[PDB]
RNA sequence: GUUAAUGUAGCUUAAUACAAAGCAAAGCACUGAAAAUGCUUAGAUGGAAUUGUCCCAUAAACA
RNA sequence: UCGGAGAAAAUCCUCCGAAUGAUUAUAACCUAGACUUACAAGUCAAAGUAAAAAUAUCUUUGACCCAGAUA
């Protein structure tokens, strides 16, 4: 009786939700399925905004609105890296590319694929872009002041599961200008096979201390051999981990498209493969000579062919 | 032809390949408890004494998309932390983040009294107009 | 009759297998486990059975549970026993059907 | 006391099903699924079968 | 002068990070009252270390 | 004969009830896998299809033969 009693449902709900998160000795569901200058500046603006009567009037008249672009730019500078890191880990980029190592993104990298001439499709984290839209190389811009920019097909390999294909890699990029990068790998369009799901493509940016000869990494131009596009980021960055530290991220998802047929035929010059999603066969207990109290259908579950046979006759 | 060598079985490792296809399992039990856990992605809206928040969380429990008045950029342009317009705005902020993240389908579980609340109705209007769907599609067996 | 636990914890269970019978709710459905009108518990997936304790939250609409839940003291909340099955197989895989 | 009665479909088909009603209340009439037409239609009481 | 001091907002040994947090408390509406519910209100790190003592503002008693 | 409570899985052991009734916005067809059980009878149910815009809750009888009723 000493303890007070919850007066509303919400109080119990929130307490229960917190209770679940805390560890417990008994078995539970989770086990199995699992500076000061700024502050002074910040306060001044808030008092100014509070003083503004027009803001108060608009709020109580429920007509106010907020500029999206300004918030987006502010979010990127202040705490965008923290949110950006979450997405990469959720999509498995860290575990599959760096074997579990984590690097916080810092440069608000920007990419967009030019569509025709009037418009250009942006490439955020987790966006969906068709292979046709990615036929040509995109426009890349970032605030710097060397660099290496890299492309991967994380899950598009057709023979070896671990390996991945390069689209193009520029090295020895000075400052922001990108035309000065060495074209180690010429650009190729995405080619995800039909019926094989969603593939994730990643944009990587590494800070370069001093220019390094990537002669071994360089691929011939033009190169249409898949045996040469295969590589591993983990070992690749191991040989350059002294002068290379990642600083950028951007990825998108793409499905099959008609252009993919052209890529496999015209330049890859091979027959395109087709994949289908197959479910495991249904489970049936072992067959019995006498199926007591089972319907006539019992015999159908164990037959292979649907057409009659006549044996010796 | 070297290029024509292909393994019999493809192995996509995308953590969201099956979920987007619609062929991934959703937990179907919890018939004596509220709320139902048969969702790929769920939206939780929390109202505190001084702040209002909203999260998108996967079944395992990891938050993927989050918007909160605690975020600095939001408040500096925000007159009041607890307003009907603020609920609309935080929803609009969340909506844009979801679309770029690619989370086009979601589910919401408003309690009866909370559902009647005008602010929540306004928030739903913000999400639906932005095009985030508040009911997931049925699984394909 | 013979009310009891048909399938004990740590046993491979196929889809449709009945796990428990009960006149009253001694156990509650959990993950991938359904309810029969007679209140029996069956498995909705192939996997391993597990018994675990967990917090109980009722539907808002039902009166009796809400009345009791709010009346509980601030210190703690009531618990219950839940049943879950852990799936043990991938639902499907991709295979090469044709080269065109 | 209660009486068992036969409800007949008014779709032109002969489909019927048996229901229960207390002898005190009026004759029953209901909506029900008609398999032959594959639609919901009215069923109207036509005859008495037995008293239970 | 020595103690004792009291030193993020009623409370918290919230926090120093990507926020000065959570809770208590307040107004109006909703008619038995209260509670619940919806819409609203007002706020603080004296200030450090170093944390899981100063430090001076302050400070009764010591004096 | 069947069901509920104690003894506690024995009894000619200690008790109460049942051979229904009320409300029903009307609850289809088809089908993996299981419980219960000497036999016979009795329970629960994914997916698919169909009507609609998913389950009616209260909670307990009788084989075969042989005669009925109508369409
Ligand atoms: Mg039998
Ligand atoms: Mg079904």
Curated annotation (Swiss-Prot), chain A:
Pfam families: PBP. GO terms for cellular component: cytosol; mitochondrial inner membrane; mitochondrial large ribosomal subunit; mitochondrial ribosome; mitochondrion. Residues 36-59 form a coiled coil. InterPro entries: PEBP, PEBP-like_sf, PEBP_euk. It comes from the Eukaryota. Signal peptide: none annotated. SUPFAM superfamilies: PEBP-like (SSF49777). It is found in: Mitochondrion. Its main location: mitochondrion. GO terms for biological process: mitochondrial translation. Component of the mitochondrial ribosome large subunit (39S) which comprises a 16S rRNA and about 50 distinct proteins. Belongs to the phosphatidylethanolamine-binding protein family. Mitochondrion-specific ribosomal protein mL38 subfamily. This is Large ribosomal subunit protein mL38. The gene is Mrpl38.
Curated annotation (Swiss-Prot), chain B:
The keyword Iron-sulfur does not apply. GO terms for biological process: mitochondrial translation; rRNA import into mitochondrion. It is found in: Mitochondrion. One of its GO terms (cellular component) is mitochondrial inner membrane. It comes from the Eukaryota. GO terms for molecular function: 5S rRNA binding; structural constituent of ribosome. Together with thiosulfate sulfurtransferase (TST), acts as a mitochondrial import factor for the cytosolic 5S rRNA. The precursor form shows RNA chaperone activity; is able to fold the 5S rRNA into an import-competent conformation that is recognized by rhodanese (TST). Both the cytoplasmic and mitochondrial forms are able to bind to the helix IV-loop D in the gamma domain of the 5S rRNA. Component of the mitochondrial ribosome large subunit (39S) which comprises a 16S rRNA and about 50 distinct proteins. This is Large ribosomal subunit protein uL18m. It comes from Mus musculus. The gene is Mrpl18.
Curated annotation (Swiss-Prot), chain C:
Keywords: Mitochondrion, Ribonucleoprotein, Ribosomal protein, Transit peptide. GO terms for biological process: mitochondrial translation; translation. GO terms for cellular component: mitochondrial inner membrane; mitochondrial large ribosomal subunit; mitochondrion. The keyword Transferase does not apply. GO terms for molecular function: structural constituent of ribosome. It is found in: Mitochondrion. Component of the mitochondrial ribosome large subunit (39S) which comprises a 16S rRNA and about 50 distinct proteins. Belongs to the bacterial ribosomal protein bL27 family. This is Large ribosomal subunit protein bL27m. The gene is Mrpl27. The chain holds residues 49 to 148 of 148 of the full protein.
Swiss-Prot record, chain D:
The keyword Mitochondrion applies. GO terms for biological process: mitochondrial translation. One of its GO terms (molecular function) is structural constituent of ribosome. It is found in: Mitochondrion. GO terms for cellular component: cytosol; mitochondrial inner membrane; mitochondrial large ribosomal subunit; mitochondrion. Keywords: Mitochondrion, Ribonucleoprotein, Ribosomal protein, Transit peptide. The keyword Transcription regulation does not apply. It comes from the Eukaryota. Component of the mitochondrial ribosome large subunit (39S) which comprises a 16S rRNA and about 50 distinct proteins. Belongs to the bacterial ribosomal protein bL33 family. This is Large ribosomal subunit protein bL33m. It comes from Mus musculus. The gene is Mrpl33. The chain holds residues 14 to 65 of 65 of the full protein.
């Amino acid at each position: 009786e000493r303890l007070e009693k919850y007066r509303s449902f919400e109080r119990y709900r929130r307490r229960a939700e917190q209770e679940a998160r805390a560890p417990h000795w008994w078995r539970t569901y989770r086990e199995h399925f699992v500076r000061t200058q700024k502050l002074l500046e910040r306060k001044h603006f808030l008092r100014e905004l509070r003083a503004n009567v027009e803001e108060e009037r608009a709020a109580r008249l429920r007509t106010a609105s907020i500029p999206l672009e300004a918030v987006r730019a502010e979010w990127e500078r202040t705490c965008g890296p923290y949110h950006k890191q979450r997405l990469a880990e959720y999509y498995g980029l860290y575990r599959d590319l760096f074997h579990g190592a984590t690097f916080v993104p810092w440069v608000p990298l920007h990419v967009a694929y030019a569509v025709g001439e009037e418009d250009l499709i942006p490439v955020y984290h987790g966006n969906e872009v068709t292979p046709t839209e990615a036929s040509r190389a995109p426009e890349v811009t970032y605030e710097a002041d060397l660099w290496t920019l890299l492309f991967i097909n994380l899950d598009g390999h057709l023979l070896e599961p671990d390996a991945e294909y390069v689209h193009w890699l520029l090295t020895n990029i000075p400052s922001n200008r990108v035309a000065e990068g060495q074209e180690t790998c010429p650009y190729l369009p995405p080619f995800p096979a039909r019926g094989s799901g969603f593939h994730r493509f990643a944009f990587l940016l590494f800070k370069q201390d001093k220019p390094i000869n990537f002669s071994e990494d360089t691929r011939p131009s033009p190169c249409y051999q898949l045996a040469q596009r295969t590589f591993r980021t983990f070992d690749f960055y191991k040989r350059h981990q002294e002068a290379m530290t990642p600083a950028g991220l951007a990825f998108f998802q793409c499905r099959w498209d008609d252009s993919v047929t052209h890529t496999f035929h015209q330049l890859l010059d091979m027959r395109e493969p087709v994949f289908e999603f197959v479910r495991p066969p249904p489970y049936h207990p072992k067959q019995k000579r006498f199926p007591h109290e089972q319907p006539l259908r019992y015999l159908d579950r164990y037959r292979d062919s649907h057409e009659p046979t006549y044996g010796i006759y | 032809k070297e290029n024509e060598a292909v393994a019999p079985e493809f192995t996509n490792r995308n953590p969201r390949n099956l979920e987007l296809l619609g062929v991934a399992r959703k937990e179907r039990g919890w018939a004596t408890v509220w709320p139902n856990r048969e969702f790929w992605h769920r939206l939780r809206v929390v109202k505190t004494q001084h702040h209002v928040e909203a999260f998108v969380e996967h079944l395992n429990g990891q938050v993927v998309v989050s918007a909160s008045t605690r975020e600095w950029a939001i408040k500096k342009h925000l007159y009041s932390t607890r307003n009907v317009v603020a609920c609309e705005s935080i929803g609009r902020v969340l909506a844009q983040r979801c679309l770029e993240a690619g989370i086009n389908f979601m589910v919401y579980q408003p309690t009866p009294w909370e559902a009647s609340s005008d602010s929540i109705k306004r928030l739903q209007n913000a999400m639906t107009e932005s095009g985030v769907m508040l009911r997931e599609p049925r699984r394909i067996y | 009759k013979h009310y009891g636990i048909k399938k004990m914890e740590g046993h491979y269970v196929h889809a449709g297998n009945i796990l428990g019978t009960q006149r009253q709710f001694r156990w509650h459905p959990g993950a991938h486990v359904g309810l029969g009108r007679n209140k029996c518990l069956y498995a909705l997936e192939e996997g391993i059975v597990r018994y675990t304790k967990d917090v109980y939250v009722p539907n808002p609409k039902n009166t009796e549970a809400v009345d009791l839940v709010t009346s509980l003291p601030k210190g703690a909340v009531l618990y219950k026993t839940f049943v879950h099955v852990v799936p043990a197989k991938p639902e499907g895989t991709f295979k090469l059907v044709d080269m065109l | 006391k209660t009486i068992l009665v036969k409800l007949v479909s008014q779709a032109g088909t002969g489909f019927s099903f048996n229901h229960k009603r207390s002898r005190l209340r009026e004759k029953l009439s209901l909506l029900h699924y008609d398999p032959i037409v594959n639609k919901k239609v009215l069923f109207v009481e036509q005859k008495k079968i037995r008293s239970l």
